[PDB]
Structures are given as C-alpha cells and as structure tokens.
C-alpha cells in the first residue's frame, strides 16, 4: 500500500520547506541537476541564519520591554554583531534606523 | 481572481516560536525576514552555481552548497551553518 506522505522537511528535522527550496533550486537556472541533499543542506543553513537573527532580535525586543519584534529590533540585532554586520553590510533595512553612536569628540567636557 | 503568492512567513514564524515561544513579530519584520531569507538563498545558490561551473560539474550537491556557505558566511557563521547543514543532511540520509 502507498505510504502516507512524510515531508522532507520533517525527515530532515527542519522547519523550513526543503521541498520549496528544491523547487527554487530547480527553477532558478542554477545547474542542470540538483542533488537530493543540496536542498536539505541549504534549508538547514537558512533555518540557522533565520533563527540566529530572530533570536538576537527577540533579545533586543525583550530588553526594550516590547513583545513583538520590529524592524528597529532587527536593525539593532544585525548591526550589534560583527559577523552579521559583515554579512549584511551592504543591506538597508526599512524603518530600521541607525545605532545610537555619537563620536567622543562631540560630547561636552 | 486572486492567485497564490508564496512566502517564508509561516516558516519564519515557526522558527520564532522555537527561539522565543512568547515573542511575537510584526508584519514589517516578517517582510524584512522574507527578504533576508530570499537574499541569502540567492547568494548561496549563485555561489554554488559558479562553483559547479568552475569545476565543470553539472549538478549542485551538498558539497557545492557547503563550499558556497563557507565562502559567503564569515567567521563562526560558516562553522555553525556547516554543522547545522551537515546534521540535517545526515538525518535526512538516515531517514
């Protein structure tokens, strides 16, 4: 008998859609062929990066006594990190603002 | 009449409920997270495609994606993304 469907995401233990990632890899004109483990590996990487950014933004929101993550929290989380700020240095986040930063020589005394 | 517009909103939200069960997320933060996911996806996929073309390979494998990740993600981002992806691929192969 036909087995009940079990998503490749669940097989890998991921939240992100391994099947959708594989579809995008096939449709994106990246290569003639796409190995079976490539969308799994990529979905895991995307899940890791998304989880990291969301967790830093949630920490920033908790420190600001806000329940819901906002673009300000995302910007704070991304810019407050050397590696994320190197990854997304060229990126602009809408309504993210800027880090509070005043040069020492401008401050009085 | 309307048509389906796929997005990563549900997956971002389901990852959020793991990293911070009680914390919510605004719609604009969802949009920014969608843009981030798409951008990183295109970066890694393009780098893997270029690696395959450089090696004359026609297929993109987990080794291609791993090399793209190590090239793009700086510092410990590369190490931890490699570890996460390797764990996921190993679990997928075992199951």
């Amino acid at each position, epitope marked *: 008998a036909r087995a009940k469907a079990k998503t490749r995401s669940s097989r890998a233990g991921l939240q992100f859609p391994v099947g959708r990632v594989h579809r995008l890899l096939r449709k994106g004109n990246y290569s003639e062929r796409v190995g079976a483990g490539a969308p799994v590996y990529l979905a895991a990487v995307l899940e890791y990066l998304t989880a990291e950014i969301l967790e830093l933004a949630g920490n920033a929101a908790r420190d600001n006594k806000k329940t819901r993550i906002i673009p300000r929290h995302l910007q704070l989380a991304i810019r407050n990190d*050397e590696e994320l700020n190197k990854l997304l240095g060229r990126v602009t986040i809408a309504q993210g603002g800027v880090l509070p930063n005043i040069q020492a020589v401008l401050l009085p005394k | 009449k309307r048509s389906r517009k796929e997005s990563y909103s549900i997956y971002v939200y389901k990852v959020l409920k793991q990293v911070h069960p009680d914390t919510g997320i605004s719609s604009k933060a969802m949009g920014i997270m969608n843009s981030f996911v798409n951008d990183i996806f295109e970066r890694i996929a393009g780098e893997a495609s270029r690696l395959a073309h450089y090696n004359k390979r026609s297929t993109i494998t987990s080794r291609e994606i791993q090399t793209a990740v190590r090239l793009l993600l700086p510092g410990e981002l590369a190490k*931890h993304a490699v570890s996460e992806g390797t764990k996921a691929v190993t679990k997928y192969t075992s199951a």
Partner: single-chain antibody, 227 residues
C-alpha cells in the same frame, strides 16, 4: 532568579577504559545552550562539548554530550589517565551565565596572554590585562570568569570589542568594569575595593558573538590575592 545548575555527581572514581557519565539539571529551560569543560588542577579550563551535543575543536569523540531542556548529560567512553580532572557545565542561554558545581573524576593558534599573579591590599584597585592574539580581535567577545576554591567558577561579565558593549553579572556591578584597546588587542578588567573575598583566579575566555558558541579559548589565569 539565576539559573541553578545541579551536577548531581559531585565526584566519581573509575578505572581505565570504562564509561563514566556525568549529568546536570537546570532550574529553567535553557534550550540546549549548555557546554562542558575540562579543568585539570592549576590549569586553565578547556572546552569539550558545546551546544550540549557538539564536540569542540580537536577534542576526541570519547566525549559525548546529550539531552536538552533542563536535563543534560556528559559521557566519557574510553577513560585514560589524563582524564582525571574537574568537569563543569556552563549554561549561556540566559544573561547570567552559570557554571555547575563541578564533578571531580579520579582514575585509579588562538592565544590569550594574561598577566601573572598580583598581590594586592584591601580597598585599592587592580587592573588585569588580556592580550589577545592569533585571531580577529574585534569579532569575539572576551568573557571574564572568576574561580574561587570555595564557590567554584563564576561568570563576571564580558566586553564586545567590536562596539565596546559590556554586560556584567549583577554580583559584580561596580566591582568589575571592562575596557578594550583595539590598537593593542588588549582587554582590561579592573577590580575596585578589593576584599579578602575577592581572592581568586580570574580567567579571560574568548567566546564568539554567536549564541551557540561557547567560551572556547581561555587565558592561563591571573591569581589575585588580597591580604
């Protein structure tokens, strides 16, 4: 409110080649952000397991961590004479990082240059330098850890040289204040109003800004003695 870590086995005795398992209990869920360390006496602690399951760089597969949530465990499969040391769990999921009480086990190039022992009199101040080499100084936080022979390991606080941001343990506000010098790759901890209680060995510890990253490389430790 600080998360209590409860290493149930205070000490074990074992022979060569047989398995030894050490466990930890948390007071609150830390979501796998727990590490295991090996400290041989009068040496700096070395990390073995990070993220509660992953092996550290260059540590053999003999060490196997397991668990999640509040219950965690450490396994050593093939014991050797060298394995006689003290093992500490470390949670870093919540802001005050907490080390375990430590389990004693008896069996029958990143550099952090830290200053030597400093004798000091009470009420004055002492400033301990950290000279970081072999890596991108700004990309990693420097974690400072205090080790008494009576209260075990205590996490003091950290500085992020990338943006000079600091976070302190509430037990050490005012007592400790951290500064950084990018031009010399040097991080300074100063202790104010030294007291006999402050007699302890202080370790600097590199830790990446990544949340799952642990305190991986440790300075040799500066012993501060208050008369």
């Amino acid at each position: 409110m600080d998360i209590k870590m409860t290493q149930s086995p205070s000490s074990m005795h074992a022979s060569l080649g047989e398995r030894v398992t050490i466990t930890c209990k948390a007071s609150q869920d830390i979501r796998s952000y727990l590490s295991w360390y090996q400290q041989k006496p009068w040496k700096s602690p070395k990390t073995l397991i990070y993220y509660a399951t992953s092996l550290a760089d260059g540590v053999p597969s003999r060490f196997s961590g397991s668990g999640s949530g509040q219950d965690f465990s450490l396994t050593i499969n093939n014991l050797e004479s060298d394995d006689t040391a003290t093992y500490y769990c470390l949670q870093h999921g919540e802001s005050p990082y907490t080390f375990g009480s430590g389990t004693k086990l008896e069996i029958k190039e990143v550099q952090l240059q830290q200053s030597g022992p400093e004798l000091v009199e009470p009420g004055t101040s002492v400033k301990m330098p950290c000279k970081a080499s072999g890596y991108t100084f700004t990309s990693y936080t420097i974690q400072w850890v205090k080790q008494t022979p009576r209260q075990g390991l205590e996490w003091i606080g950290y500085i992020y040289p990338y943006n000079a941001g600091t976070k302190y343990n509430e037990k050490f506000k005012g007592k400790a204040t951290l500064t950084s010098d990018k031009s010399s790759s040097t991080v300074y901890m100063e202790l104010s109003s030294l007291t006999s209680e402050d007699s302890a060995v202080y370790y600097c510890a590199r830790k990446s800004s990544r949340l799952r990253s642990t305190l991986d490389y440790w300075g040799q430790g500066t012993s501060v003695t208050v008369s």
